[PDB]
Amino acid sequence: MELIGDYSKAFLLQTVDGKHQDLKYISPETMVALLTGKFSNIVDKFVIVDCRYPYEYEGGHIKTAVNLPLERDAESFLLKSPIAPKRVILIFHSEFSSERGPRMCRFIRERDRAVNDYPSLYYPEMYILKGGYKEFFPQHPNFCEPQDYRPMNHEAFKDELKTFRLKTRSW
Ligand SMILES: [Cl-]
Numbered sequence: 001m002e003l004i005g006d007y008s009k010a011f012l013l014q015t016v017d018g019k020h021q022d023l024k025y026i027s028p029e030t031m032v033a034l035l036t037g038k039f040s041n042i043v044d045k046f047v048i049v050d051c052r053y054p055y056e057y058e059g060g061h062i063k064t065a066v067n068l069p070l071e072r073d074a075e076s077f078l079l080k081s082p083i084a085p086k087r088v089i090l091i092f093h094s095e096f097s098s099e100r101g102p103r104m105c106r107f108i109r110e111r112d113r114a115v116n117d118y119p120s121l122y123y124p125e126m127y128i129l130k131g132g133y134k135e136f137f138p139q140h141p142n143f144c145e146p147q148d149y150r151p152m153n154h155e156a157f158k159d160e161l162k163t164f165r166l167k168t169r170s171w
């Protein structure tokens with residue numbers, strides 16, 4: 001397997017197959033391994049980036065996850081003042097981690113490359129949580145808060161979906 005983004009070392013986590021062949025995916029179990037400190041001696045810090053809309057996040061998210069659905073906010077939070085460490089790892093996810101999560105992952109790498117001298121990166125190691133929140137919640141409810149799951153297409157949030165999308169950079 002290839003080295004991480006800055007070609008400094010191998011990827012630390014075991015991966016699983018995912019739709020986007022060029023990205024690295026991890027399972028809910030591996031996400032829990034990170035959250036339970038199984039890699040504390042090597043991983044200084046990791047950030048779980050929930051790329052879903054605010055109402056989805058509010059309806060139930062992974063503990064400690066940060067809601068950064070808008071590209072400009074994800075960039076500001078992660079690259080304005082890079083989180084320095086050991087390793088730093090980013091884990092992106094959305095509802096199914098089919099579109100929004102992967103898109104933000106690619107976006108951050110694009111920006112990371114743009115503000116660095118090749119091949120250096122602030123976040124050389126990034127993963128996608130396979131199955132997204134939809135598959136994580138049924139496996140580890142006590143690692144979520146609140147302990148619920150609100151889909152993007154929830155019937156009671158149709159207006160909220162439209163409101164949020166009109167704030168995005170492109171549709
Ligand atoms: Cl997938």
Ligand SMILES: [Cl-]
Pocket residue numbers: 069070071072167168169170
């Ligand atoms: Cl956006």
